[PDB]
Design a protein around this ligand. Structure first.
Ligand SMILES: *[C@@H]1O[C@H](CO)[C@@H](O[C@@H]2O[C@H](CO)[C@@H](O[C@@H]3O[C@H](CO[C@H]4O[C@H](CO)[C@@H](O)[C@H](O)[C@@H]4O[C@@H]4O[C@H](CO)[C@@H](O)[C@H](O)[C@H]4NC(C)=O)[C@@H](O)[C@H](O[C@H]4O[C@H](CO)[C@@H](O)[C@H](O)[C@@H]4O[C@@H]4O[C@H](CO)[C@@H](O)[C@H](O)[C@H]4NC(C)=O)[C@@H]3O)[C@H](O)[C@H]2NC(C)=O)[C@H](O)[C@H]1NC(C)=O
Ligand SMILES: *[C@@H]1O[C@H](CO)[C@@H](O[C@@H]2O[C@H](CO)[C@@H](O[C@@H]3O[C@H](CO[C@H]4O[C@H](CO)[C@@H](O)[C@H](O)[C@@H]4O[C@@H]4O[C@H](CO)[C@@H](O)[C@H](O)[C@H]4NC(C)=O)[C@@H](O)[C@H](O[C@H]4O[C@H](CO)[C@@H](O)[C@H](O)[C@@H]4O)[C@@H]3O)[C@H](O)[C@H]2NC(C)=O)[C@H](O)[C@H]1NC(C)=O
Lengths: 211, 208
C-alpha cells in the first residue's frame, strides 16, 4: 500500500524538566510503517553525538494496515534546559533514505514570568460561580506549567490558555479558575502555581482572596 | 500535494452586513508544470458561481500556490450552510472535496468582564488591562480595544479556549503606560459575536 512512514518527535512535558524527581523524555514516533516490512531502526544523537539508552517499544499493528513504532529517550533535566539537541533518525528498508527529526528547547535568553492574580469582576458577583484569574506574562521560552490550589489541595475546575506571543517577543498566558461564589465570599484563599525554568527553584505561587 | 486547505470567513465579516465574508480554498503543492486547477463550489450541495480564482502564484520550493475565494451570504453562514470546494487536476487521480461550516449548536452570548491591573503590577512603567470574555458559543469572535473612540494598538488576545461546559472563553490583554491608567482614562473592550444583541457589545475599565 502506497505512501511512506512519517516521523514525529515530541518534547518533554515542561514540569518534567523542571523537577529533579520526575522523568523527562523525548518521544520519537514513526507511523505509516509498511505492513509488509515493519522493521525500523532508531538512532539517537545528543548534539550530534550518538547515544544508546533509548527504549524502543514493540511495534503496534494498526487497523489501517500499517505499523506505528515508538522509541523513548529519557533525557537529563540539565541537558534539555542547557539547550541540547535531540535527533531521532529512523530507517526502514522501504525508505530510499532515513528520516531525521531534531527538537530542542526554543532558542533565546530565558525570562522570568511575572505572576499576577486578579479577582472576579464586580459584575460577575450576580452569578453563582466566579472566575479567579492568574496572568503570567513576560516569560521565555513558552514551556510553562500552571496550576491552582486551595488549602494545599489542587482545584478541579480551571482552564489555561496556550501561551501567546507578546509584542516584545516574550509569552503570556491566563489561567481561569472557576469556583462557587460562596467559597470566594467565605474568604478562602486560592493560589496560582507557576513552574518555569527562569523562576528561582523553578517555582512560584501567588495567592488571591477577598478583602 | 496538491493539498487543499479550506478556511472560514473572519468573524467580524459575517456579523456586519457592509463587510464581505468569504470562504477561501487554498491549494498548495501545485506542480511547476501543471498549475491549471479548477475550483467547483457547492452551497448545501448546490453549485454556485461567484467564486473568484486569484492569479496563480509561484513559491520557493519550486511549487505553485493557487487560491479561490468565494463570497457568502452573512445569513447563510450564520444559518449553518455547508460550503464545499472541489479541486481538480492530472497531478491527482480524482478530485478533492473540502467542506466547512459554522460550528453547530445554540449560540450563546459572551459575558464580558473587565479587570484592572493587579496591585503588584503597579511597580512597572506599563500595566495590563484585562478583558475576560467567557460563556460564548461558537468560538467565532472578535475583540478590540479603544479609549476616547480611538483604537488602542498595544493588545494581544488569546485564542478561544474550550471550557468545562462546552462554551469558549478568551482573554485580551491591553498594555498601557501606567500614567495613562492613573490619570483616569477610560478604556473599553469591545466584542462582536453572533449571540450578542446587534452582534456587538462594549465594556469599560477606569481607575475605580
Ligand atoms: C512549499 O512551500 C509552501 C509555502 O511555503 C508550503 O505551503 C504550506 O503547506 C502546508 C501543508 O504542507 C500548509 O500547512 C497547513 O496550514 C494551515 C494554516 O493555514 C494558515 O496558516 C499559515 C501560517 O500561520 C499560513 O501560511 C497559511 O497560508 C494560512 O494563513 C491563513 O490563511 C487564511 C486564508 O487564506 C486566512 O483567512 C487566515 O487569516 C490565515 N491565518 C492566519 C491569520 O495566519 C493549517 O491549519 C494546517 O493544519 C491542518 O492541516 C494539516 C494537514 O497538513 C493537519 O496536520 C492539521 O491538523 C490541520 O488539519 C486540521 O486541523 C484542524 C484543527 O483541529 C481542524 O480544524 C481541521 O479539520 C483539520 N483538517 C485536516 C484533518 O486536514 C497546516 O498547518 C501551509 O499553510 C502552507 N503554507 C502556505 C503559505 O499556505 C508547502 O508545504 C511547501 N512544500 C513542501 C511541503 O515541500
Ligand atoms: C493509520 O492509523 C494511524 C494511527 O491512527 C494514523 O497515525 C496518525 O498519523 C497522523 C499523521 O498523518 C498523526 O498526526 C500527527 O499528530 C501529532 C500529535 O500527535 C499526538 O496527538 C495525537 C492526538 O492528539 C495522539 O493520538 C498521538 O498519540 C500524539 O500524542 C502525544 O504522544 C506523545 C508521544 O507518545 C506525548 O509525549 C504527547 O503528550 C501526546 N499528546 C497527546 C495529546 O496525547 C501532531 O503533532 C502532528 O502534527 C504535526 O505534523 C503535521 C503534519 O502531519 C502538521 O500539520 C502539524 O502542524 C504538526 O507539525 C500530526 O498531526 C497522528 O499522530 C498519528 N496517530 C497516532 C495514534 O500515532 C495514520 O495517519 C493512519 N494511516 C493512514 C494511511 O490513514
Amino acid at each position: 500500500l502506497l505512501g511512506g512512514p512519517s516521523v514525529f518527535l515530541f518534547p518533554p512535558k515542561p514540569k518534567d524538566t523542571l523537577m529533579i524527581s520526575r522523568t523527562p523524555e523525548v518521544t520519537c514516533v514513526v507511523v505509516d510503517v509498511s505492513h509488509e516490512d515493519p522493521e525500523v531502526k532508531f538512532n539517537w544523537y545528543v548534539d550530534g553525538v550518538e547515544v544508546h539508552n533509548a527504549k524502543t517499544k514493540p511495534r503496534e499493528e494498526q487497523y489501517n494496515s500499517t505499523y506505528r513504532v515508538v522509541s523513548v529517550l529519557t533525557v537529563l533535566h540539565q541537558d534539555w534546559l542547557n539547550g541540547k539537541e535531540y535527533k531521532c533518525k529512523v530507517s526502514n528498508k522501504a525508505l530510499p533514505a532515513p528520516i531525521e527529526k531534531t527538537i530542542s528547547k526554543a532558542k533565546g535568553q530565558p525570562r522570568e514570568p511575572q505572576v499576577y492574580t486578579l479577582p472576579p469582576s464586580r459584575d460577575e458577583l450576580t452569578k453563582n460561580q466566579v472566575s479567579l484569574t492568574c496572568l503570567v506574562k513576560g516569560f521565555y521560552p513558552s514551556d510553562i506549567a500552571v496550576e491552582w490550589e486551595s488549602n494545599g489541595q489542587p482545584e478541579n475546575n480551571y482552564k489555561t490558555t496556550p501561551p501567546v506571543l507578546d509584542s516584545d517577543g516574550s509569552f503570556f498566558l491566563y489561567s481561569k479558575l472557576t469556583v462557587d461564589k460562596s467559597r470566594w465570599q467565605q474568604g478562602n484563599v486560592f493560589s496560582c502555581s507557576v513552574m518555569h525554568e527562569a523562576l528561582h527553584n523553578h517555582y512560584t505561587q501567588k495567592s488571591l482572596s477577598l478583602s
